[PDB]
Amino acid sequence: HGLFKKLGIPGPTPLPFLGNILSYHKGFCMFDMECHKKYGKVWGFYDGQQPVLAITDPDMIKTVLVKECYSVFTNRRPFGPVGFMKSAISIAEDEEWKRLRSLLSPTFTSGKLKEMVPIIAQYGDVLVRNLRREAETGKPVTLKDVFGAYSMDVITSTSFGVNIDSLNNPQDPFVENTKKLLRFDFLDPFFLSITVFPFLIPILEVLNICVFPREVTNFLRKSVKRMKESRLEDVDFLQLMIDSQALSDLELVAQSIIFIFAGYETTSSVLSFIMYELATHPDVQQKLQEEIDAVLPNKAPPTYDTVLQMEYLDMVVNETLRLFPIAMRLERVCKKDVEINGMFIPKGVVVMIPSYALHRDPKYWTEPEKFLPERFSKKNKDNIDPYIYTPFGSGPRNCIGMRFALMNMKLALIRVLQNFSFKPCKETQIPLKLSLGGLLQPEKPVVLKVESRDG
């Protein structure tokens, strides 16, 4: 625990064995907000015994995320016991990650994204139908239930060329199982013990103990094999992975499960945050509709080219991701002793970039608390540092599905907003309050009321 002292870097005093984890009672976002304000440009703390160095300087951020990615800052914090999911790209290391990256990245080229628009359009139709049902009754909507089903429908069909039709089944197996893959929350004596005694991880790995429920991984393990069967019995993410067979049968499933979960969880999450922000700013919700109407007059179906035309939509999406970067923190492990922009960083340290905190630094963002889409306007855009604003990370190891998620959320949003308007109702949580999880999640689902437009 003497490390940060010895290095001259400040921070909260750790407890023996525990480190600074009891500070996690208010969530990672408040912890990082506090430290940033108290300690300044750079601070340090201990997740159990693991030193974590938070950095704030934009050029220093470019160094660990971009310049020295391959050389020293390549991998993320080790995570286990993880079992067969060690193959997964998001937790793969060094050259294994490198070749997994160059394999799967063509999945999301412009051109392949264009192909996905007519495929998503079908589910866009089922989306507007389900919400219309809720606009007729006047009943409240748990948005995570409808945008989730939509996210799940979109990512299965674009990646595996299979229509699991989640949007009509409220009790679809692909959504029940996939949502029960994270969940871990604060103070679970499992994850808590693993942060404090990470030397236990090997034993758990040896006893075949796993973070993910085997029930849930069995179903996902099965489902993907069935989907792989269909393609081999008559070019997307699936196809791209079959062709490499250098993927093992189990490595393929690992990658799939990443994309399935990322598809479902990430997309619907952000969508709920966007929807909330619009419903609580109808001034902004209307200005967006005006734009959607102008670029696509009388309910004209959206296209890849027309999405790129909607400047205000992109502003609104950007501004939500500023307040709600679901990853909260970027991180990368230091492979070897190094000096960067003047600062010594020892081997083994976790270097952490506090996205959430920096998106609210009064130094770069005037009135950081407020939802103001005008921040990202063409005339204002050039004062934003691209290393301060990092909803999708930066460099060779950024979010592989960035552009897909942006297009797909914009697609849903267009289909929704050209048809409906969203008003806050009874059950709606104002102000919004966030869970104490590993990804950014609201405590109690976002509930809004749905009105139809004109007549």
Which of ligand HEM, ligand KLN, none lies near 411, with the C-beta cut-off 5 to 8 A by kind? none
Residue 258 touching ligand KLN (CB under 6 A): yes
Task: Please list the alpha-helical segments (H only) found in 161-266.
Answer: 173-179, 189-196, 201-206, 214-231, 237-242, 249-261
Residue 327 as a binder of ligand HEM (CB under 6 A): the answer is: yes
383 to 36, 41, 213, 294, 339: CA distances (angstroms):
21, 20, 46, 29, 28
Q: Which of residues 400-419 bind ligand HEM (CB under 6 A)?
A: 400-401, 404-405
Contacts with ligand HEM by CB under 6 A: the residue count is 25
- Residue 410 binds what, of ligand KLN, ligand HEM, none (CB under 5 to 8 Å, by partner type)? none
Q: Which of 77, 86, 221, 287 binds ligand KLN (CB under 6 A)?
A: 77
Residue 275 interacting with ligand HEM (CB under 6 A): no
Two tokens, residue 306: 């027309």
CA dist 137 and 157 (Å) reads 30
- Tell me the C-alpha distance between 393 and 327, whole Å: 9
Give residues preceding each break in the chain, C–N over 2.5 A: 234, 245
Is residue 47 close enough to count as binding ligand KLN by CB under 6 A? Answer: yes
Q: Which of 345, 355, 428, 383 is nearest to 141 (CA)?
A: 428
What minimum distance in Å lies between the beta carbon of 247 and ligand HEM?
15
399 annotated to bind ligand: yes
Of 320 and 419, nearer to ligand KLN (C-beta) is 320
Q: List the interface residues with ligand HEM, window 75-114 (CB under 6 A).
A: 89-90, 97, 101
Measure the CA–CA gap between 79 and 93, rounded to whole angstroms.
11
| One of 195, 318, 398, 435 touching ligand HEM (CB under 6 A) | 398
Q: Which of 144, 329, 359, 449 binds ligand KLN (CB under 6 A)?
A: 329
Query: Residue 263 binds which entry of ligand KLN, ligand HEM, none, with Cβ cut-offs from 5 to 8 Å by kind?
Result: ligand HEM
Output the smallest distance, CB 369 to ligand KLN, in A. 21
The CA–CA distances, whole Å, from 331 to 14, 251, 326, 393 equal: 20, 24, 14, 9
Tell whether residue 190 is a contact of ligand KLN (CB under 6 A): no
191 binds ligand KLN (CB under 6 A): yes
Question: In whole angstroms, how close is the CB of 270 to ligand KLN at the nearest point?
Answer: 10
| 181 contact partners, CB below 8 Å, separation of at least 6 | 212, 213, 216, 261
Q: Give a three-class secondary structure readout of 317-385.
A: HHHHHHHCCCCCCEEEECCCCEEECCEEECCCCEEEECHHHHCCCCCCCCCCCCCCHHHHCCCCHHHCC
- Residue ranges in contact with ligand KLN by CB under 6 A: 21, 28, 47, 76-77, 79, 85, 88, 90-91, 181-182, 184, 186-188, 191-192, 195, 258, 261-262, 265-266, 327-329, 331, 399, 438-439
Known binding residues for heme? 399
